[PDB]
Homo-oligomer: A and B are copies of this chain.
C-alpha cells in the first residue's frame, strides 16, 4: 500500500490508494485507509489491516473521551502520542505503520509519522507503505516550501499514481482528503482522473 501526507499553510492533505492484498490476490479493491479519528483528525493505515483498525478504534475511543472531558478540540500531537504508546507497547505483536494528520487551532495543520516500532516524528511531508519506496525521490525533488491546497493535492495524486503503477500491493483508486479549519473535503480519483505518465514505449 501507499499512504502520503503533506502540510500546507492552514491545513494538510492526505492521500492513499484503495488496495489491500493477501498475497497476490486483491481481497478489496476499494478499501478506505483514510480513517477519521475525530472531526478534524485523520489516520492513514499501513501494515496489518487488523492492527491498524484496532489501534484506530481504541485511539478514537480514548481521544473522544479526552476531548469531551476537556471540552476543547483535541490535538494532533495528542492523537499521535496515543498511537505511539500503543504501537510501542505492542511493537512485537503489531506490524503497523501509521501517519497521522489533522488541524488544530494551537498549531494548525500538522502531520506526524508513526512507523513500525512506535516512534513519533513530525514531518512536512511523510509517506508510508510498501510503495513509498518508489516515490521518495519524486517527493524529494518535487517538494517546495509554500505549496497551496490544490498544488499539494496534485502533488499527492501524482505521487500515489507513480507508486501505484509500479507497486503490485498498491493500486486501485486514489482517495484524497484535505483538512483545515473549515472542514474536510474528501474526493476519489478513478480512471482518467488519476494522473497518467507515459511509458517508455520503445
Contacts and interface: CB of A to CB of B under 8 A. Distances in A.
Interface of A: 122-125, 133-138, 140-143, 145, 158-159, 162-163, 165-166, 197-198, 200-202
A79 B56 CA distance: 55
23 contacts: A123-B202, A124-B200, A124-B201, A124-B202, A125-B200, A133-B133, A133-B134, A134-B134, A134-B137, A135-B137, A136-B162, A136-B166, A137-B137, A137-B138, A137-B159, A137-B166, A138-B141, A140-B162, A140-B165, A140-B166, A140-B197, A141-B162, A145-B201
Contacts of A143: 198, 200
Contacts of A198: 143, 145
Given A133-B134, A134-B137, 10 more contacts: A123-B200, A123-B202, A124-B201, A134-B136, A135-B137, A137-B159, A138-B141, A140-B165, A141-B142, A145-B201
